[PDB]
Design a protein around this ligand. Structure first.
Ligand SMILES: *[C@@H]1O[C@H](CO)[C@@H](O)[C@H](O)[C@H]1NC(C)=O
Ligand SMILES: *[C@@H]1O[C@H](CO)[C@@H](O)[C@H](O)[C@H]1NC(C)=O
Ligand SMILES: *[C@@H]1O[C@H](CO)[C@@H](O)[C@H](O)[C@H]1NC(C)=O
Ligand SMILES: *[C@@H]1O[C@H](CO)[C@@H](O)[C@H](O)[C@H]1NC(C)=O
Ligand SMILES: *[C@@H]1O[C@H](CO)[C@@H](O)[C@H](O)[C@H]1NC(C)=O
Length: 402
């Protein structure tokens, strides 16, 4: 075992030691190596000569100057590599990773790489997961067709790459299942006529799409209609949507999870969840939701969890606390301005496992919270956190009305 290193099994860690070069005398039997948070600039010839057992390597958070194919000679057995946080400024065009013929996962996030060239990563036939996050400011290529030749690729991240103009109009693949497009400019792109109207459509069996933090202020229905029809998860978290056309969910026939948190919805209104939706989880926390229209949730028969947390909900109505919402597994209503709840409303919650009610100004005067006192007292195991009375800090579960 080398100086300045923690050796544990065949897993070896030399993190945050200010190293300017690789420690000599790493056991040749090593299968995992970490050289994170140092000051490495070079991988001199022969440096990994004896580490033929290595399948996982992280050079995360250093100062590598360039990627050369010959840096990876002897590292051909590698299945995972990280070169994240090295701010390498250079083009990637199919000649960088030549000898990494077994590599399945590659992390290139937090660099300055000019990545979008049609031949990029074609020297990596077996690549399954590729993280290109945080390469806004490439040191340029405009071309995304490289992803369509990686026939094993399941997971891709283009997140936070300032992607907004002059790029391929279509992404194409038969293998990617998860695309992270977080932090880009889809908002500007979808405003540009029909130029990007079919951008994600060619991602054939896509299952999850993250469009959070895309500066979306509106969502035209055609844009949803042109998402891949296999989509199960859509994330629109932390945009600026003030409105949402709920009947558009019919364009997404297999959707199970919709994340709308951190937007600016003023209510659950402008329609209801549409007939036939297979929606299971609806995260609509951290909006400015003041009210819910009657029967909004009704008729979404597969609905399993709704997060209404961190809003400004004034009341809970029978008109919208209707049979679907009674059949939830999880219901979050915490952090919300609720003073009371109608009697008997939580009585037929037969599938409920967790409910959140805290951080609400509950009125604990007696012939009013009696039902809720009682219910929270009976269902203690189901409450997450504790609803407290607005006057005294007493938990609602503790009030016994006469
Ligand atoms: C490919 O990129 C390398 C740097 O990574 C560069 O030196 C070379 O000119 C590029 N090749 C092409 C086709 O432009
Ligand atoms: C990407 O490169 C391919 C290969 O030449 C070409 O068919 C395509 O037009 C290019 N796309 C863009 C946006 O330049
Ligand atoms: C919602 O979208 C549908 C198409 O999905 C459209 O026909 C309808 O007019 C829209 N409703 C509103 C109020 O924008
Ligand atoms: C949605 O509902 C409110 C009234 O509840 C209305 O002011 C708003 O204009 C509606 N949105 C659209 C686009 O129809
Ligand atoms: C609901 O939303 C809040 C954040 O807005 C979060 O604390 C919590 O994780 C969510 N609840 C569940 C059960 O995921």
């Amino acid at each position: 075992c080398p100086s300045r290193c923690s050796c544990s099994g065949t897993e070896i860690r030399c993190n945050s030691k200010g190293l300017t070069s690789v420690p000599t005398g790493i056991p040749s039997s090593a299968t995992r190596l970490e050289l994170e948070s140092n000051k490495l600039q070079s991988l001199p010839h022969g440096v990994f000569d004896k580490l033929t057992q290595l399948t996982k390597l992280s050079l995360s958070r250093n100062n590598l100057v360039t990627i050369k194919p010959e840096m990876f000679v002897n590292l051909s057995r590698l299945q995972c590599l990280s070169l994240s946080h090295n701010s390498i400024a250079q083009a990637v065009n199919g000649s960088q990773f030549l000898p990494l013929t077994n590599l399945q996962v590659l992390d290139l996030s937090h660099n300055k790489l000019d990545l979008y060239h049609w031949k990029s990563f074609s020297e990596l036939p077996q690549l399954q997961a590729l993280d290109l996050s945080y390469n806004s400011q490439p040191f340029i290529g405009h071309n995304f067709s490289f992803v369509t030749h990686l026939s094993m690729l399941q997971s891709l991240s283009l997140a936070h790459n300032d992607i907004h103009t002059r790029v391929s109009s279509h992404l194409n693949s038969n293998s990617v299942r998860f695309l992270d497009f977080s932090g880009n400019g889809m908002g500007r792109m979808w405003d540009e006529g029909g130029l990007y109207l079919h951008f994600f459509q060619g991602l054939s069996g896509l299952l999850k799409l993250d469009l959070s933090q895309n500066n979306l202020h509106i969502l035209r229905p055609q844009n949803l209609d042109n998402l891949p029809k296999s989509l199960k998860l859509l994330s629109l978290r932390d945009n600026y949507l003030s409105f949402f056309n709920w009947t558009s969910l019919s364009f997404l026939p297999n959707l199970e999870v919709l994340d709308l948190a951190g937007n600016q919805l003023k209510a659950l209104t402008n329609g209801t969840l549409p007939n036939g939706t297979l929606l299971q989880k609806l995260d609509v926390s951290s909006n400015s939701i003041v009210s819910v229209v009657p029967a909004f949730f009704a008729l979404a028969v597969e609905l399993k969890e709704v997060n209404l947390s961190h809003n400004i909900l004034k009341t809970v109505d029978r008109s919208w606390f209707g049979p679907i919402v009674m059949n939830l597994k999880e219901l979050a209503l915490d952090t919300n301005q609720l003073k009371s709840v109608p009697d008997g409303i939580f009585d037929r919650l037969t599938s409920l496992q967790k409910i959140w009610l805290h951080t609400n100004p509950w009125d604990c005067s007696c012939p009013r919270i009696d039902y809720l006192s009682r219910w929270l007292n009976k269902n203690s195991q189901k409450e997450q956190g504790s609803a407290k009375c607005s006057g005294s800090g007493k938990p609602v579960r503790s009030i016994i009305c006469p």
